[PDB]
Subunit: 599 residues, 3 copies
C-alpha cells in the first residue's frame, strides 16, 4: 500500500490506473498511460535532464527538445507531434549532423508530422546568419542524402523569422526544405517577418514527388538591400504544386527581387493564389542543372486562376543547358489569371510583363527550347504611365507560344528592346480574340504596339485588333529590316485605324515574301484615264508589287464617277482597278484601302 | 494515506498521477492532468455552480457555458475548443456586453478556434427575433470595435437555425459575423434550416484581411415572405474569399430574394462552388458607404469555375457614391462558370442574366464607375420560354466590359428595357468568339437579339455571329434613334442570315458616323445601263451614302450577263459597280450584298 | 482502502480520479475517464475476449475489432475513430450481414468518421477474390438499402490492396463504396498497390448528395490482364465531385483499361487533378439504367483545370436508353485542362482523343442525346507518330458541342472512321479561335484534317485556321458524298494554304446547298476576250455555279493587263469578272482565288 501511493505518484502512475472506453464491457481493458500515449506534444520532450518541464520563452532554446521529439516518434514508425497553441517556442542554435551542411535548425524525419498550433520564432542568435529552419535532407551533400517521405506540417500556427536581415548576399535562408521529398506538404501555416531566400522548397533537382503547399500565408519575407533574391516557394520535384496560398510583401526591395513561386519540374502547378507586393509571379523553367531526378523536360506546367499585383513580370519562361544536359520546356498553360502592375514610375522596377521569355542566368538568349505554351483567358492591366509594360517581353529564343482570348491592357503587346538580344522566333501565335485595351491610348508617341525586334520570325500569326483609337502610336506592328519574316500571317483589322499614317510597317519590305500572308490599311493616291464609261484607275506610287488584292475603305463623294471598289496590281508595282466615269475626264483621288496579300 | 485517497478523488487527483510518454526515460515527467490540459472541450465548462456536468438538450441553454469556455481559453493565448460529436447543443438566450448591439449570442475571441463536431441549434426563444449566432465585434458600434484575429471555426458539425421565420422584414439574422476580422475562417460546417439575412459575414467596411469560407454547406436558409433579402456569404474585407462551397435553397422566396455570395472589397474571390435554388450568384460591388478600411476601389475581383442553377442574375456589378466618397469597380474576371436559369415562367422572377450592370440601391444609374471587366470561357443557358433571359442586362452606366469566348444560349445577348434607364456605355467589347446558341430560335418575334437601349455607345465592339437560323427575330442588332453611336465597330456575319429582312438596324442612321465601322447583309435592287460589254449597275434606292464597299452574297442565275461582284457608292447615295453584258440590254436584279463601311 | 487500490487498478479506475481543466475553479469537476472518453481509437476495441489488447500484424485479422468500434460509436450518435499511426492493420476476412452481398469487409455507419493515420492492408485471404473494403450499404440489395449520412474518411494514412490480382474478370473490387450516400467524403488518403475495379464510388443510381474526394492519391491500382475495367472514382450521386487528387498507374494494362473519374449524375465535377499512366481521363455519361435517384438528365457537368498524360481519350461523353427511360447529357463544360497522349506507337492503345462521343456499352450510336457542351481554353498534344490522335472523335449521334479558344496539336481535328458508324451531327461549332498546332505537319499523307465521316451535318460551323503549312494532307476538310450537309458554315482561312491542291472537298457537291455558307481557296484557270480596255475574264471550268463571289489571292506579274480582282458566276457555272487590257489580246492565266458562297 505504501508502495501503491509511490507507484501512483511516480512517472509510471498512469500505467497503473485502469480504463475502459465509456464503460463498454467489450472494449479493451487499458491503462490511462495507454490512452495518453496515443498523442504526443512538444511538452513530452521539453524538459531538463531531471525530467522537469521547461517553459518556452525568448531565453529558452527549444531546438534540442523538438529534435528529441522528432527523433523518438520517428523510431516508432511515425505520428503527429503537436506544437502547442498559446506559446511561442524559440529556436536559438543550429542542428547537428546531416543538416549542418544546410545551416539546418531542425531535421524532419519520415512519417513524423508537425501540427504547429503555436508559434515558432527565431532568436537573435540567427541575426545576420544563414539558416534553414526545417530540413529533410539527412546529409550535407544532397546527392548522398536519403529521402524524406510522408511528412506533413500543418496547423493554425506561425513560423516567424524574427525580422533579421541577411548578413551577406551570398547567404541562404529557408523555412522548410523538404529535401528529396515524397508525399510531403505544408498546409495552413503563416510564414512571416523575415529576410529569406525561400520560405519553402520542395524536392531536390527532380528527386521527390507529391509535394504541396496549400492554404499558407507568406507575409513580409524580404526586408533588406542585402537579400540577393527571393522566391517564396521553389517547386523542384514533379507531381507537386502550390494551391490557395496568400503572398504579401511591403518592402521596396521585394518589388525588385521577390517572386512568389518557381516551377522547375514536370507536372507542377500554381493555382488559386493571391499575390501582392512582389516583383514576379512565377518562374516556369527547366534548368539543365536540375535535371537529375526527373529528366530534362519540364512539361504539364500549370499557372491558373491566380490574382496578382506585381511590379515586374507575371510568368517567366526559361530553359537552358549545361555541358552535358539540355533542358526543354513544353506543354504549359497559363489561364484564368487576373494580374496588374502596381502603381509605380516607368522603369522603376524590372520591365513589366504578363509573359517574359527570359535569357538564362548568364544572360544567354540562344539556348532556350520553349514551345507548346498556351496563354488563354487572362487579364492584364498596367497603369497608363508605365511605359515598360507588355503582354509579352520576348527576349530569348522562342519555339512557340500561343495567345488566345486574353485581355491585355498595357503599353506594348509584343516587345523586345532594340539593340539588345535578337531572338529567333518560331510559332508565335497571337489570335484575333486577344482584346487590346485602351488605358495607354495617347501615350505611344514613337512606339510600335507590336515591336518585332527579333532576328527572325517564322510560322507566326499576329492578328491585330484594336478596340479604340490610339493615334499617338507610330505603328500597330513594325518589323525592322534586320528581322527576317517568312511563313507567317500578319493582319491589322481596320477598325479605329482610319486616321493612322502607319498601320503595319515592314522596314525591309518583308511582306513581299512568298509565304507571307498579310493585310493592313493604307492610303493610296490614284489617277484614272479620261475615258467615259468603264475606266481604269492606277496608283501613282509603285510600291504595291506584293499586293494580291485591295478594296475601298473610303466613301465616294462624287456623282460623276466612282473609283474601283477593288484592285489588283501590275508588274511595275502599281495598283489597278476598273471604275466608272459617268462623264469623261481624268480623275484623281486619295482613298483608304485594305491592302491584301494572299488573304 | 487517508489524505492520498482524498486527493486522488478530488478535482486535483489527475494532478497527482504521474506520466511519462511511452515510458521514455528522456521524456518529461508529467502528471495526467498536464496531458489532459493539452485539449479542451465544451464539457469542461458545461457544468452547474457546484461543478457537476450538465447534459445538453432542448431544455438546456448552452450559451453561458460556451462563452465561459471561449473567455477562459482566450485568457491563455488561445487554443481550440471542441463542441463534441453525438450531442446537440442548444442556444437559448442572448449574449451580453459588446455583442448585444448586434443581437449576438456568442462572442468569438482572438486565437480561440471552435471545432464544431456536434450540432448547434437555436431554441425557440429566438423564434420571430433577430440574432447573430457568433459575433467577433467586441463593441455595439462596429467603428469602435477591436479586431478579431486568428479565429477558425471548422469541423464536420452543424449550425441549425431552428426553422424559425423572421418576425419583421427589418430584422437581421446571421450565423457568423467575424467583425473586423484578420485571418479568420469557416471550414467544413453545414449551415441549415432557417430564415436569415446572411450565414457568414467577413470583415467590416473594408477592415479585415485573409478571411475564407471553404468546403461549407448552406442549406435552406430562407423560408418566409417576411425575409427582406438574403446573401449567404458577404465578403467585406480584402484578400478574402469563398472556395468549394455548396449552396442550396428550396423556398420559392429564395428564387426572388437570395444570392449566394457578395464580394465587396478588393482582392476577393468566389470559386469552385455549386449553387441551386437561388435568385442570384454573386454581387461584385464597390459601395462608397463601405470604403473606410480598404479604400474606394474594388479591384482583383474573381468569380471562377462555379456551377449554378439560379432564377435571376448570375453576377451583378455595381459601384456607387456617397456625399464624400466615390466607389469604383475595375479589374474583374468572370471565367469558367457553367450557369443556367432554372425552369420557370417568363417574368416570374427577377430578369434572367449572366451579367447584370445594376443601378444602385436607390435606383440611380448615373453613379457607376465600372470598367476593365473580363467575361470569358463561361456557359449560360436559359430554357426557350424564358423571354427575360440575357447574356448581359446593361441597366446602368458602364465604363467597360469585355466578352471573349463564352457560349450564351438565352433570349437576348445585350438587353436593356426601353423607356427605363438610358445608360451611357463605353468600351463594351463583344468578341466574335462568343457563340450564340439556338435554344430560343423561333421565339424572338418582335425582338432584337442585341437590343441597344442606351443613351450612347462609344468605343464599343459588337461582332455578331449566329450559329443557326432564327428568322423570328426582328433584327440581330438594333440602335434606337435616341442612342448615339460613335467610334465603334458593329458587324453581322452573314452565316444563317440570307433570309433575314433586317440584320443590323440603325433607327437614327448612326452607322453613317465618321468613326463608325460596320458591316452587315442587305438586299439591294439594282438596274444597269443597256450597253453591251462592261456596264454599270446602280442601286434603285439612295440610302447607301455611308457605304465604302459592298460585295455579292448571291449567285447569278443568268448566262447573258453578270452583275458586279463588288460595289462602291456615289454622292447621291446609290451603290454602283461594273458588271458585264455579254449581250446588251437594261438589266434589273435583286441581290444579297454584304454592306461595308470602313471595314 | 484495500478496496480503493482495487478500484484504481480496475478498468473503472480512471473513473475515480478527479480532474478539473487547468485547475480552473469554474470548470467542470470531472473524472479522468470522462476526458479520455472524448476520443476513441481502434485500440479501444482491438482486444481479445478477456479485454487484453491485441497487437496488429500480418497474422492478425483486425476486421472484427474495427467493426465493433464503428458499431459502438454509431450507437452514441457518432464520432471519429482513429486508426493509429505507426501500425499496419490487416483485414483478413469478409464482413457479415448487409454488406456480404457486396463482398464487403467493413460496414460504414452514419456519423461515424474514420481518421486513418496508419495503414490498412489486405491479407492474402483476399488474393484472387472480390472485395469491397468499406461499404455504406446496409443491405445486399442496394434498392432496399438504407442511407449512409455524414461519414468522412480522412488522414495521412494508407489503404493498400496487397498487390493481389483479380481471379476472374467478372469479379468486382472497390476501396470505399459509400452507398446511398449523403454528405460523405474521403480526404488525404493514399490508395495503392492493387488490381481493382474502382477505388471509390459515390452514391448509387442517383441516390446521394454532397459526396467528395479531395487531396487523395491513387497509385498502381491495375496490375493484371484479368482486370476487365477500372475507373478510380465513380461519381453516381449529384452535387458531388473530385478535386485536387493525384492518379498514377505504371501497368501496361492500365493504358488500355483504366479511367481516372466517371461523372454520372447532375451537378458533378472533376477539377484540379493530375493523372498519369491511364487510358482515359473522365467519362461524363447519363446512363438510363442509373436514373432512379436524381432523374434522367446529367447537367452541370464540369471538367476543369486538370493535368493529364493518358493513352486513349481525355473526356468521353455519352447517354443511352433502356426500355422505359431515356438518358440525356447537356450543359457540360470542359475547360482549362492540359492533356497529352503519352509516348506510344500508333494504334497501340485506344484511339487518342481530347473529346470522344462514344457509342453506348452495346455499341449503339443512335441513342445518344448530348448537347450544350462547351470545350474551351484547353491544350492537347500528341506526339507526331500517333496517327490515332484527334481533337474530337465523333462516333455517335451528337446534338451539339461547342469548341472555342483551344489549342489542339494532334493528327486530326474532327475524326470518325469511315465505314464504321455514321453519326447524325447537329450544332457542332468549331470557332476560328481554335489553334491547330503543327506537330503532325508532314505526317498527313492521304488524310483529311477534318474528316467528316458522318451521315449528316446540320447547324454546324467549322472555321479552319492553320498556323503553319502541312502540304502532306489531302485536304483541310472533306465531306464524303454520303454525308448530307445543310444550314452550316464551313471556312478555310487562306494562310499557309497557297500550295495546297485541295483545301475543302465536298465529294457530293454539298457546298451548293441553299443554306450552306462556305469559303475556301482554289486555283482557277481563266481566259479573257481580246478587247482592249475593260475586258471580261472567264473560268475555263464550269464547276462554280454555287459561287457567290471570288477574289484574287495571287499577284499579277503582267504589265499590259490585269485580271479581275473579284469575280461572280454565270448560270453555266463559269466564273466571270472584269479586268483591264492596256493593250488588246486574249489572255490566259492561272490564279489562286478565295471562293465564297453567301459569305
Ligand atoms: Na550547403
Ligand atoms: Na501552343
Ligand atoms: Na536577322
Ligand atoms: Na446593430
Ligand atoms: Na476588359
Ligand atoms: Na442619347
Ligand atoms: Na452484389
Ligand atoms: Na455549347
Ligand atoms: Na447520309
Amino acid at each position: 500500500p505504501d508502495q501503491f501511493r509511490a507507484i501512483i505518484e511516480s512517472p509510471e502512475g498512469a500505467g497503473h490506473v485502469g480504463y475502459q472506453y465509456r464503460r463498454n464491457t467489450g472494449s479493451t481493458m487499458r491503462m490511462v498511460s495507454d490512452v495518453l500515449d496515443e498523442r504526443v506534444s512538444l511538452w513530452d520532450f521539453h524538459c531538463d535532464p531531471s525530467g522537469n518541464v521547461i517553459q518556452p520563452g525568448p531565453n529558452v532554446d527549444s531546438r534540442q527538445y523538438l529534435q528529441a521529439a522528432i527523433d523518438y516518434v520517428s523510431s516508432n514508425g511515425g505520428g503527429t507531434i503537436t506544437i502547442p497553441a498559446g506559446y511561442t517556442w524559440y529556436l536559438g542554435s543550429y542542428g547537428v549532423g546531416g543538416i549542418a551542411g544546410h545551416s539546418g535548425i531542425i531535421q524532419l524525419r519520415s512519417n513524423v508530422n508537425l501540427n504547429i498550433e503555436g508559434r515558432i520564432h527565431l532568436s537573435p542568435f540567427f541575426d545576420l546568419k544563414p539558416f534553414q529552419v526545417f530540413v529533410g535532407f539527412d546529409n550535407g551533400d544532397p546527392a548522398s542524402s536519403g529521402n524524406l517521405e510522408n511528412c506533413h506540417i500543418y496547423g493554425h500556427g506561425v513560423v516567424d523569422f524574427g525580422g533579421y536581415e541577411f548578413g551577406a548576399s551570398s547567404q541562404l535562408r529557408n523555412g522548410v526544405a523538404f529535401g528529396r521529398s515524397y508525399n510531403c506538404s505544408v498546409t495552413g501555416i503563416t510564414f512571416q517577418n523575415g529576410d529569406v531566400t525561400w520560405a519553402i522548397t520542395l524536392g531536390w533537382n527532380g528527386y521527390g514527388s507529391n509535394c504541396y503547399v496549400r492554404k499558407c500565408r507568406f507575409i513580409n519575407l524580404v526586408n533588406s538591400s542585402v537579400n540577393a533574391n527571393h522566391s517564396t516557394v521553389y517547386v523542384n520535384c514533379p507531381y507537386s504544386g502550390v494551391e490557395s496560398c496568400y503572398f504579401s510583401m511591403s518592402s521596396s526591395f521585394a518589388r525588385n527581387i521577390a517572386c512568389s513561386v518557381e516551377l522547375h519540374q514536370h507536372d507542377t502547378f500554381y493555382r488559386g493564389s493571391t499575390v501582392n507586393g512582389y516583383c514576379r509571379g512565377a518562374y516556369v523553367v527547366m534548368h539543365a542543372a536540375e535535371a537529375a531526378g526527373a529528366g530534362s523536360y519540364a512539361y504539364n506546367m500549370q499557372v491558373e486562376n491566380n490574382i496578382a499585383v506585381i511590379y515586374g513580370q507575371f510568368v517567366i519562361l526559361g530553359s537552358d543547358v549545361t555541358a552535358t544536359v539540355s533542358g526543354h520546356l513544353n506543354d504549359v498553360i497559363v489561364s484564368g489569371n487576373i494580374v496588374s502592375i502596381g502603381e509605380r514610375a516607368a522603369f522603376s522596377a524590372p520591365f513589366g510583363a504578363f509573359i517574359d521569355i527570359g535569357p538564362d542566368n548568364s544572360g544567354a538568349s540562344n539556348v532556350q527550347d520553349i514551345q507548346r505554351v498556351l496563354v488563354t483567358g487572362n487579364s492584364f492591366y498596367a497603369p497608363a504611365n508605365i511605359t515598360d509594360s507588355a503582354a509579352i517581353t520576348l527576349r530569348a529564343n522562342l519555339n512557340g507560344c500561343t495567345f488566345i482570348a486574353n485581355n491585355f491592357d498595357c503599353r506594348y503587346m509584343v516587345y523586345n528592346a532594340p539593340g539588345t538580344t535578337s531572338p529567333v522566333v518560331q510559332n508565335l501565335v497571337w489570335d484575333k480574340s486577344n482584346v487590346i485595351g485602351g488605358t495607354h491610348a495617347n501615350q505611344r508617341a514613337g512606339q510600335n504596339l507590336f515591336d518585332m525586334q527579333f532576328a527572325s520570325v517564322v510560322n507566326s500569326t499576329i492578328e491585330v485588333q484594336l478596340s479604340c483609337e490610339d493615334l499617338s502610336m507610330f505603328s500597330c506592328i513594325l518589323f525592322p529590316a534586320s528581322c527576317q519574316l517568312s511563313y507567317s500571317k500578319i493582319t491589322v483589322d481596320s477598325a479605329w485605324t482610319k486616321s493612322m499614317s502607319n498601320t503595319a510597317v515592314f522596314e525591309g519590305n518583308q511582306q513581299a515574301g512568298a509565304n507571307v500572308y498579310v493585310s493592313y490599311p493604307a492610303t493610296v493616291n490614284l489617277t484614272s484615264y479620261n475615258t467615259q464609261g468603264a475606266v481604269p484607275f492606277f496608283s501613282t506610287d509603285t510600291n504595291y508589287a506584293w499586293v494580291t488584292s485591295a478594296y475601298s475603305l473610303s466613301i465616294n463623294e462624287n456623282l460623276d464617277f466612282s473609283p474601283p471598289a477593288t484592285y489588283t496590281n501590275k508588274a511595275n508595282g502599281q495598283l489597278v482597278g476598273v471604275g466608272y466615269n459617268e462623264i469623261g475626264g481624268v480623275r484623281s483621288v486619295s482613298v483608304r484601302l485594305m491592302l491584301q496579300r494572299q488573304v
